[PDB]
Symmetry: D2
Subunit: 115 residues, 4 copies
């Protein structure tokens, strides 16, 4: 699988478990078409979103549903979601790990890209 | 003005100057409609985006054109842009500062909400 | 003043107020000697730590007492403190802002160096 | 091994390889005694620093030699090192992953603590 998502909780110092993640791909008409979705495991990782065949060149949006995560823990956070938008595979296939570090009023997102 | 945006450059250790910023408000049909925009100043700040009367409760998206910023510096970026999506909530008097700290393959964003 | 420290709270989305900050300069015997200190203001900022004449080239450590900050808010922290160690270098006129963004199990720090 | 260190490069979107890491433990006389050291692998991870028997309660300092890393890549960075100071094992043994995300003028550090 060439796209993995990892989410961490900076309040608890733990993986962020059961975080919903939706991936979209920009269509020819410039709309966001649904591409894949899943939820993080007990390790905070989401594997198996897509395949080498399906994950073609394009502009992708990874929406990490941070508000739903915080609300399930009884917390009212600031952001609706974390949104990571990037062009993928423009110079051939790559493997992408998208990591997000979450706090109620702040997040960071980082990409590790390997060949 | 109840909404300010501040952008910093983690590679050069400087304000991120002349970065385009677009603010959208979510419409009833779930589309994003333009709300305010500008370019960051020499201090990395964008003031005067909106007024108290215009900035009603709702869902807002702040899109920071990070790819064009890095390209103007000759540095290869990952993201198309940085997105910050949040709900404005009238809980007494409030001023929102949206800060973004930019690196080529990572960004962080924080909200500082003060009375 | 050539050195300012700014501290933000990523859990509450606020300046980090009344945080103790200690600055040390590395002495010839590799020990850290006290140089300046204070507490952050209601804006999360600590101004007036030093003067142009006092702030010579050398290695400095900024220690931010994050554990006491979180304890005063009733929140369980990981770190004893946040440390920022850097060399001051006379490359033309320079002002240093050391910013720290605090969460219970994570912090980030950035230097904004301006002319 | 109950202490692992992971380092990422936010400029390249890659593991930070060959980063030196020194761990110290506060001694009874309040000095930092050397505890363990190593270097990150091609994955950006440093395993095998210590053992369950050796990693007793205490206050530990993890120094990540970021300046040497950037200088080996031909870059002049701001910080001397990243310094992570924490009390370990106070409520019994835990496993600690310390992650650092590096840019030339900024870094973040996060702890994931598991039982
Ligand atoms: O007001 C400033 O001068 C200033 C300077 C720095 Cl380095 C800053 O770094 C930051 C790093 C992460 C998140 C927010 C900030 C800031 O809001 C910030 C503000
Ligand atoms: O693989 C891990 O166990 C692990 C642990 C921690 Cl704390 C991590 O913190 C991070 C903080 C910012 C950006 C990325 C990461 C990570 O990718 C990360 C990975
Ligand atoms: Ca292509
Ligand atoms: Ca309301
Ligand atoms: Ca010099
Ligand atoms: Ca104990």
């Amino acid at each position: 699988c060439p796209l993995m998502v990892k989410v961490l909780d900076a309040v608890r110092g733990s993986p962020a478990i059961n975080v919903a993640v939706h991936v979209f791909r920009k269509a020819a008409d410039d709309t966001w078409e649904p591409f894949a979705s899943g939820k993080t495991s007990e390790s905070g990782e989401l594997h198996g979103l897509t395949t080498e065949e399906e994950f073609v060149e394009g502009i992708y949006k990874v929406e990490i549903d941070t508000k739903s995560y915080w609300k399930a823990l009884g917390i009212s956070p600031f952001h609706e979601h974390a949104e990571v938008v990037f062009t993928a595979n423009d110079s051939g296939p790559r493997r992408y790990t998208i990591a997000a570090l979450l706090s109620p009023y702040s997040y960071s997102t980082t990409a590790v890209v390997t060949n």
